[PDB]
Every structure is written in C-alpha cells, then in structure tokens.
Amino acid sequence: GGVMKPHRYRPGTVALREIRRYQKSTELLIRKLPF
DNA sequence: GCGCGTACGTGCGTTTAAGCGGTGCTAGAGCTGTCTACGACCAATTGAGCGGCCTCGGCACCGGGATTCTGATATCGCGCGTGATCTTACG
C-alpha cells in the first residue's frame, strides 16, 4: 500500500503558459533592489 | 530523414535576501533680496573672402610586356588487400 502521483507535464507547456501570463500583465519583471 | 547524445523542464527540497513598516538623522534642493558683468546696437572704420581669369599637371588612357592564379593531370607517398615464402602445430 503506497501513495501514487497522477502524472507529469510534457516539456514546453509551462513555457507557453508563462508566455501568455507575462504577455497579459505589465508589471516589471526584474527585481527592483538588485537593479 | 534517421540515429545518438544530452540540456534542461518539472518537481521537491532547502535556503535566503526581497518588500513593509517603524524610527531617526539630515543634504541639498528650492525660493527671496543684492549686486554686478555683458551682449545688442549705431557710427564709423577697415580689410578678407568670392569670383573671374589665367596657368599647369596627376592621372586616364592606350598599348605592350611581364608577373600570378585555378583547373587539369601525373608522380610520390601511404595504407589496404592478396599471393609467395618461412615458420609452427598437428596428423
């Protein structure tokens, strides 16, 4: 008796999700204080 | 198109300095009153750059000759493949 995990995403999908995510917003991306 | 090696994504785990707030100090930014130096302008003066017109040549052109460069070919060289001779093993 063990605990099993459902699945794993194929590569590149989250790349696209991030692409749309950051193409929708406008907030600055580089962190402020190091800059 | 096929095959092989792999850079890196997700995910997890862990770790950390990125933001809020809270206080405290203060630098130079900003706005009044003084004071003064200087650039436009007119007269009058003087002189320099532009254009016309002379003059002359550095370089294009021609022609010829001399020097270089790919493309093709062949030889030397090296490496791979096969048969002859010497060697070793078994029968």
From TrEMBL:
In Swiss-Prot or TrEMBL terms, this protein is called: Histone H3
Provide the family line. Answer: Belongs to the histone H3 family.
Kindly list the places in or outside the cell where this protein is found, as annotated in its UniProt entry: Chromosome; Nucleus
Species per Swiss-Prot/TrEMBL record: Xenopus laevis (African clawed frog)
Top-rank lineage group of the source organism: Eukaryota
Sites of N6,N6,N6-trimethyllysine modification:
M4
Parent protein range shown? 34 to 68 of 136
Record gene name: LOC121398065
Outline the subunit composition: The nucleosome is a histone octamer containing two molecules each of H2A, H2B, H3 and H4 assembled in one H3-H4 heterotetramer and two H2A-H2B heterodimers. The octamer wraps approximately 147 bp of DNA.
